[PDB]
Paper text:
Gram-negative species couple polymerization with translocation across the periplasm and outer membrane and the master regulator of the system is the tyrosine autokinase, Wzc. The tyrosine autokinase domain forms the cytoplasm region, while the periplasmic region contains small folded motifs and helical bundles. Autophosphorylation of the tyrosine-rich C-terminus of Wzc results in disassembly of the octamer into multiply phosphorylated monomers. We propose that the cycling between phosphorylated monomer and dephosphorylated octamer regulates glycan polymerization and translocation.
Previous work showed that mutation of K540 in the Walker box abrogated Wzc phosphorylation. In contrast to phosphorylated and enzymatically-dephosphorylated protein, purified non-phosphorylated WzcK540M was homogeneous, oligomeric (based on molecular mass in gel filtration) and yielded discrete octameric particles in negatively-stained EM images. Although the data were processed in C1, much of the structure displayed eightfold symmetry and the application of C8 symmetry improved the resolution to 2.30 Å. The WzcK540M octamer is ~165 Å high (cytosol to periplasm) and 146 Å wide and possesses a large central cavity with side portals that open to the membrane bilayer. The transmembrane region of each Wzc monomer comprises two helices (α2 K31 to L50 and α12 I428 to F447), which form an X-like arrangement with multiple side-chain interactions between them. The resulting arrangement of the eight transmembrane helical pairs is unusual; they are not closely packed, and this creates oval-shaped portals (20 Å wide by 45 Å high) located between the pairs of the helices. The conserved tyrosine-rich region (Tyr 708, 713, 715 and 717) reaches into the active site of the neighbouring subunit with Y717 positioned at the active site. Y715 sits in a pocket, where it makes a hydrogen bond with E675 from the neighbouring subunit site. Approximately two-thirds of the surface area buried by the formation of octamer occurs in the cytosolic region, with the remainder arising from contacts between motif 1 of the periplasmic domain. The interaction between the C-terminal tyrosine-rich tail and the kinase active site of each neighbouring subunit buries around 440 Å2 surface area (of total 1200 Å2 buried).
Residue numbers in the entry:
A (entry chain H), B (entry chain G), C (entry chain A): 17 to 64, 85 to 261, 409 to 477, 494 to 721
Amino acid sequence: IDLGRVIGELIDHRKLIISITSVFTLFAILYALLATPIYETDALIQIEQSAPETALLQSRMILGKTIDDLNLQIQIEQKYFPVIGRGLARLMGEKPGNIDITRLYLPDSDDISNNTPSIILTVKDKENYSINSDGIQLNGVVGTLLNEKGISLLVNEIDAKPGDQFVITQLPRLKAISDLLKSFSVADLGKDTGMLTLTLTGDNPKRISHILDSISQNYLAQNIAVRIIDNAVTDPNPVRPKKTIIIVIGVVLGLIVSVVLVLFQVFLRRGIESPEQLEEIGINVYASIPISEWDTLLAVGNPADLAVEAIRGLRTSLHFAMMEAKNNVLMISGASPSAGMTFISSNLAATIAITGKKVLFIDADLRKGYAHKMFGHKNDKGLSEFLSGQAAAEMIIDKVEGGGFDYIGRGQIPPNPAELLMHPRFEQLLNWASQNYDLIIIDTPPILAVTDAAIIGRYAGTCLLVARFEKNTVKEIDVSMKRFEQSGVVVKGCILNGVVKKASSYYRYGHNHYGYSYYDKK
Amino acid sequence: IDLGRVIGELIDHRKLIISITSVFTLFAILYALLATPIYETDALIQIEQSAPETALLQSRMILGKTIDDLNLQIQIEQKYFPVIGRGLARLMGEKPGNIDITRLYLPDSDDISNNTPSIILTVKDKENYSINSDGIQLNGVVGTLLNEKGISLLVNEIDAKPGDQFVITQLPRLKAISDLLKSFSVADLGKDTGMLTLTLTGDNPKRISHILDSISQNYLAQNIAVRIIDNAVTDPNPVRPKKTIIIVIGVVLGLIVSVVLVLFQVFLRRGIESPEQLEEIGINVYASIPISEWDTLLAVGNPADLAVEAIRGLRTSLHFAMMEAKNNVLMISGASPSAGMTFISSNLAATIAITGKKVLFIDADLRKGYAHKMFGHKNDKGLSEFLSGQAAAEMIIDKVEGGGFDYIGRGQIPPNPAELLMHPRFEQLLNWASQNYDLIIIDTPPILAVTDAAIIGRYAGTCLLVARFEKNTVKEIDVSMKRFEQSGVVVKGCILNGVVKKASSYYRYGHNHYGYSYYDKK
Amino acid sequence: IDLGRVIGELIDHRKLIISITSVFTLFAILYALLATPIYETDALIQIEQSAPETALLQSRMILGKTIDDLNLQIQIEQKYFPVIGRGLARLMGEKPGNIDITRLYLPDSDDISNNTPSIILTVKDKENYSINSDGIQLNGVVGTLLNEKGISLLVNEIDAKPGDQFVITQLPRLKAISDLLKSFSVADLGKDTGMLTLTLTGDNPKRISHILDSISQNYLAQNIAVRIIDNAVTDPNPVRPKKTIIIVIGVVLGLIVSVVLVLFQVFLRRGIESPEQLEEIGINVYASIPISEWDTLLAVGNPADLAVEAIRGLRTSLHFAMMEAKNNVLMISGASPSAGMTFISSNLAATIAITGKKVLFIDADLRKGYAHKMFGHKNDKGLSEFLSGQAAAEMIIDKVEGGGFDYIGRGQIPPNPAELLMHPRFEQLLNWASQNYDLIIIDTPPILAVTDAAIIGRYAGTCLLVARFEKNTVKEIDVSMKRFEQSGVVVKGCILNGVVKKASSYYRYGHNHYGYSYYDKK
């Protein structure tokens, strides 16, 4: 692989790459805008050492005094049902509702796991409120304390709108200490100075400054039984989430994921990429039919289609290739199902019939042939009925309206399709057809599925394989040709079908084999 | 090997990989959820150095005082018969039963090895209990102490349900010290500060906090004859087992074990992977029969089977390959036993007999031929009886009901099978059969087992080998062909049997050689 | 690639390289000249340690005293609508207007986000001024304080011109401290000395010296309740923007961007670079027509053109190449549209007609042929009308005035162009034309677009392909020739059209294939 190859692959997979990168960036931006902002407050303490003082500041004695003074064991959180309800409410300009509680004694369930009892407070108005611990409803008012059902609660100064719910947890003293200790850090900043930098993170900018002031003052009173230089102030710019580094990572992560997925699809695909791959093995490619964007025949409904023009090129190439053959019978056989053989063979018959030639189309796919459905069908007396002996040759030939050629349907699906084609009536039909027509085109099932095409190929003077652009493999075509040759059927060449324009073909090889549209635009 | 090869191997062995990875993850999750949770309590001590104080804290003098104060030599464990009975009981929400014992004097067996005497206490109710040391049953009550059979026991406040057994061990003082010392650790956390961080691990969160408080207080009283800043509190989140790192290791370990086992099976397998391996040595492969999911013949019970369609392809390939031969006798010989020769040869005779040809099936496997059992048999007068001279040719030919062809059974297993086939009656049978039939198909034993096929191959105009997909080796086929050629029998080609769809074949080679199913689904 | 190749590529892409480098340097110079200059003032303090004194200097206590003394919370900025209005005003010699404010109390909106209220002061004259916070207009005079609409303002000594607007923000105390702290740095400069180097950056050289003097004096008074050696003086040379390193980076960045863009265009282009690329595949190139700087024919309006001289070379090469051919019919077919086939074929007919030969020009591009428009047309009865049978051969032949040869127009665009060319009237026309003319030149559509040229090529004794210099690929030509050969049309060779002089061709190959102009300049 070279620079041209990888750049062509990027150009071809640009849509997948952009989609993956864009969804990654969207997730990164949604995270950076919905994650709760965490502020950081700092303070400065003058020590008259400071290494044992650092461990004393983070001790449960100093921090425990802060939990008790500020009631940090009363956890109050705004209620939001999703994991994004808090982020989007902040985006919508909704100010976070807050309630002040000074006394909270829950019945202390203290079960196997839930050591943190919780209730749900629903704001009814500015004054009164409701409480539901486990469905037990209790109505309370600011001021008057509540002592009912083993639940003591004192809510002061409800600052919110009616309908706001609040999860009120009474976490144990050690947990409240452990939460404060996890967000509280102490540094020396000079490693020799008597200066300690107390920092505290949290989602509430005002609350974390009151806590850090309490920690500094409780440590101050404890030491005198030291100087506070800078009291705790909260940085108004949140330190997390760091939006820029999250979005940039979302871009880089989306890009590298896109590349490795594209790099795998390039290294794992085995389908045909160009007619050159077939010609490298010695397989003559007579036409490359591009994908048509469009029950009528394409060569009649849209004669100017880019696919029909490539079929006209096949017509002229076949005319020079079909001379010096045994007979005027041309067999067309896809290598795999859904290769587009009936698309090519029926439109090829149309492009040759308009040239004034008498063409007979034989849908000899007794298993899955649908040429009768496509042309309009008196489905009785098809090819099956003729091979079985219950129909004459003149009774199975029909004319296509949007055609120009005669066509023979497969008939009713026989139980022994391969055995019917071996009947001598089949060769007698082709010998009779070879005298009343200029060209006989025969659709056959794929040789890698059944052997029907090998039997029919014995009576055809020219045999062509139909390969799908990306669905069929080069070796798949080579096995198909060798299977025909093993049964005495020489394949004249292959027809690549369903070619799509790709930039990687333009850089790996010097051509894309898609075809130029050519008309005066009017 | 390339990326395509390894990815195809992963796709083919995905079931083994997923099974191994899933059982590894299941074991890891069962360990992470059944291992007893171990909590960690910590304390803070202020030293006014601290390096000799660390060694004094872990001394048997300080720790020995703790063992005596809290009776740590009385080991009490809830009784569970399996290694998982404690884990699952905790999962089921069953609270662990605990009993308080203050006096435990066992008869002190002190034998060669068991220096730790043990008894089994069975809770009968809230008040009384039972005791069985070595089968000697003793009934005791909370309160009143027990002095019987040299066993002193004082159980206080039994907190459990009736039926809970308890193993009560009286371990020596040094062992109790060694157990505490193993879970007790001392650190300085500043390497200069007078701060010591005493930590203690254990399965009981309340007990380890009482022990660490005792250690701190016994060290405190001993030093004043120092300040305890933070008393021992237990972290409610267990430090072990670390579930996430155990499960993630279970995933990674299952994956790497799956890969190396798959990597060995890929590097150790020698069987045929595709018909290309045979054709690389110059062995013509006339058909690749896929594995049929299905005593009737497959070509009659299910004519539309994917295996029968590949046999129809063999029929058309054989017709073109059998012309220009000496006679109409086709010999089919597997390279190894259970290669599927009789599956192919009997179904091939059916697919050719429906074409209106007279086919004779000769089961010339006088050792293990079971064609008579498969078709319905008048087992008397088979091929053996004819070669021995006790049966006429017209008396050994039988007709298959679900057939269409005539068949000759092997007969009774002769003592000299190879010698019977050398009798001139065998060639006279084939010369007679060659005049009353269009094709004679002969089953023969594998040439690498016996020489019966080499003898029969002298009279057959066409000889084909049947190879099993993965069971037979390429060289195994090459040795079989060369052994025939060494005896004057030229093998026309090979028939690969039992092909299964594999993604690795699609990436190593450009084709899988399995065959496309082709029918209108109705 | 070698030194010659890369140097030739640089010479050929010199215009793109110079343009990119020049726009990069222009942006860098505009940045270096429009970015606001930032001055740096420094002071020297003598400490009698200095490590805790450094942290005390940057404390909010010392810096907060400076904000209050100098009213640093009153932010005054000259109003400029663009991001360059301040830079260019400084370039134009306009001195920055400044107003002195001592009292600023805004109504303190304090909404969700905007914690910094702002107003807009518009200077009306030396004495009075106007104020608009949110559209509310207020008129004030220097001296007399304003207390209206909850806005307290005291503006002293307006030094500006009437019309100058000023954004007056009252930022919070912490923000003003954070802005000063961000630009204030303290260093020791000896790491042991009692010398502290206080430095302060800012856009106002006089203001930053007053602030740093305040910081030094507030720290001096605070410490005595230390020696100031060097009072704060501002370096008159701004420390930023560093113009030289910005411009030099603009040069280097423009160069490396130019190189990588040129390096990609060289590695991504696949078009033909020289006639040697075609001859390496075995394609005979009979002429290389250079780009002509110029509805008349080029070979008549400017016979001395460099393109016409190369066509005269094609004429002499064709004369030697067209002998020993079946007939005197020459077909010319571009490989892709807009290849210049009609430019070459019509001018080639002119250069051969002046030699006294009778030439017939057949515009057989029934889809997009415009030869009739170029020569002057009685558009009725073209080639289409003749093939359809509604026009005689003698009625479709016309004479070109600026010609010398006869020409046949395409006629009205037929619905079946490819089918009309297959009519036997086409060969009868050429057989008749071959007897009344010395050479017949036939324009045809590109073979990679439609098959019209393959049909016409069957009756032409010589067939040539027209390749565009850079638009067509070598493989594109090779596919075109093989498609003709697949239809029984042998292409005699190719004609490279639109060649442009390039230095890289002179270094990769030994020639540029552009052609030397040759005339006596008079």
